[PDB]
Structure 1
Amino acid sequence: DIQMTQSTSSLSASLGDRVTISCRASQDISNYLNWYQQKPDGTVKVLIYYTSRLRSGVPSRFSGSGSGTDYSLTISNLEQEDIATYFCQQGNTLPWTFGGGTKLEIKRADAAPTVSIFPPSSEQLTSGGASVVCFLNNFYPKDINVKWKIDGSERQNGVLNSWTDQDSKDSTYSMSSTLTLTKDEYERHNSYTCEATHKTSTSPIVKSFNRNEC
């Protein structure tokens, strides 16, 4: 089979930049090389076919070049809506094979997270469980640390963290942190705090509640 390689699996660029994504085929594919965009929500569309032909309806900032085994997708003057994963595909011989994808992040100005904390619900407590949840919303860059402090002591067991995709509108990220305890463990303590550490602040952004006041 013909192996398609996109040697860069991820990249980060700014609005207005030139973005070049490369694709190499294991053998000559006679310019039967196509490019697709997959948006974060999973929607796929064709951009370019037969190396350089622009699909009707696709903006002219997308162009393709190459011959033989070596091909490139260029996005000139990168726009906000171009956050996506890009795939090449040869159509010369069966099976028709795809490259591994190149994920494109778009930069933006640094932004501090908005932090929200939530106690366990009555419903869950009744069932004998206790999940405390912290949201850190709309921050940049993606790297962020969240710590749980229970009565002032850090707690790491039972914590699970989930980052959103980059927001297609404003290029921010969001993350959820969930601390899951037994009901009996929950009732044993009073102060529940989530602290966010991020390059946007020298001191953490903190949210807290007290069990016996909720």
Structure 2
Amino acid sequence: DIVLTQSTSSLSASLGDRVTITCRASQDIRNYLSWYQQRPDGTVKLLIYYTSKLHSGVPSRFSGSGSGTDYSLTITNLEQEDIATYFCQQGKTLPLYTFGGGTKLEIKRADAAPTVSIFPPSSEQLTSGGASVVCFLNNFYPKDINVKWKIDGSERQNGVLNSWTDQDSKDSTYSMSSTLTLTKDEYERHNSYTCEATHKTSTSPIVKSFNRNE
């Protein structure tokens, strides 16, 4: 019923600096707003209830404010454990509690374009009657990245699977795999397969392609 929107899905910050997350209600919640932190290991901890009331056991770095339909969570002097996901939830009436979609909080890195590779269906798979084309986009920052496939220069978003790794902990980049699956029949009919990556750093798309009629 009462909807809760967190503007942003992920944001990038840096050690020792200040981060703000905003929650917008769809109607007034009279200050009954809480925030939680979900660690990547999956643990969840309450941080702040009733807008600003800080839960004991929780660092003073975390403070919350807001009223009516707008609320924000602030982390001052962000430090390492804080790298996590943050949900707001309104508990105005029970059982109609709602949660924001989450805001992912990661450490800001220099911005790296992805290294990109495209792969034709293995002959072994061609005997199945199946045909998957795969594209890897490796080692990029920030997470935001749009990849779109094109067969014979015409887009396809049908039967694509996109999979993101965790921000690599040793190096703070991301990688993703994108798979387009077709029948072997469709596969033979067309000739050029393309995988087009668009990134903060692109500016135009990075593309990696191939042609089955050599």
Normalised TM-score (structure 2): 0.63
**Residue deviations 1:169-195 (CA, integer Å, cap 9, x gap):** 644332222233332444567776645
**Residue deviations 1:129-162 (CA, integer Å, cap 9, x gap):** 1101111022123444546577999877765544
CA radius of gyration, larger in = 1
How many residue pairs get matched?
213
Preserved contact between residue 80 and residue 168 of structure 1 (Cα < 8 Å): no
2 and 207 in structure 1: CA distance in 2 versus 1, 3 angstrom threshold: closer
Preserved contact between residue 80 and residue 169 of structure 1 (Cα < 8 Å): no
Measured after TM superposition, the shift of residue 197 of structure 1 is 4.9
Give identity over the alignment, percent.
Answer: 94
Measured after TM superposition, the shift of residue 38 of structure 1 is 2.8
Preserved contact between residue 144 and residue 196 of structure 1 (Cα < 8 Å): yes
Find the residue that maps to 1:108 and give its secondary structure: coil
Measured after TM superposition, the shift of residue 35 of structure 1 is 1.9
**Residue deviations 1:6-35 (CA, integer Å, cap 9, x gap):** 566765544433223345779997866532
Match of 2:76 in 1: 76
Preserved contact between residue 129 and residue 182 of structure 1 (Cα < 8 Å): yes
Find the residue that maps to 2:185 and give its secondary structure: helix
Match of 2:67 in 1: 67
29 and 146 in structure 1: CA distance in 2 versus 1, 3 angstrom threshold: closer
78 and 151 in structure 1: CA distance in 2 versus 1, 3 angstrom threshold: same
148 and 72 in structure 1: CA distance in 2 versus 1, 3 angstrom threshold: closer
67 and 169 in structure 1: CA distance in 2 versus 1, 3 angstrom threshold: farther
Structure 1, 177-186 or 200-209: larger mean CA deviation: 200-209
Preserved contact between residue 9 and residue 102 of structure 1 (Cα < 8 Å): yes
81 and 138 in structure 1: CA distance in 2 versus 1, 3 angstrom threshold: farther
Within 2, Cα distance between the matches of 1:189 and 1:5? 43
21 and 202 in structure 1: CA distance in 2 versus 1, 3 angstrom threshold: closer
Unaligned runs of 5+ in 1: none
Structure 1, 104-113 or 180-189: larger mean CA deviation: 180-189
Measured after TM superposition, the shift of residue 110 of structure 1 is 0.8
68 and 118 in structure 1: CA distance in 2 versus 1, 3 angstrom threshold: closer
Measured after TM superposition, the shift of residue 62 of structure 1 is 1.8
Normalised TM-score (structure 1): 0.63
Structure 1, 191-200 or 22-31: larger mean CA deviation: 22-31
168 and 72 in structure 1: CA distance in 2 versus 1, 3 angstrom threshold: farther
53 and 135 in structure 1: CA distance in 2 versus 1, 3 angstrom threshold: same
Match of 1:189 in 2: 190
Find the residue that maps to 1:168 and give its secondary structure: coil
**RMSD, aligned α-carbons:** 4.8
Find the residue that maps to 2:193 and give its secondary structure: strand
Measured after TM superposition, the shift of residue 127 of structure 1 is 1.7
Match of 2:28 in 1: 28
Within 2, Cα distance between the matches of 1:101 and 1:202? 28
Measured after TM superposition, the shift of residue 111 of structure 1 is 0.7
99 and 158 in structure 1: CA distance in 2 versus 1, 3 angstrom threshold: closer
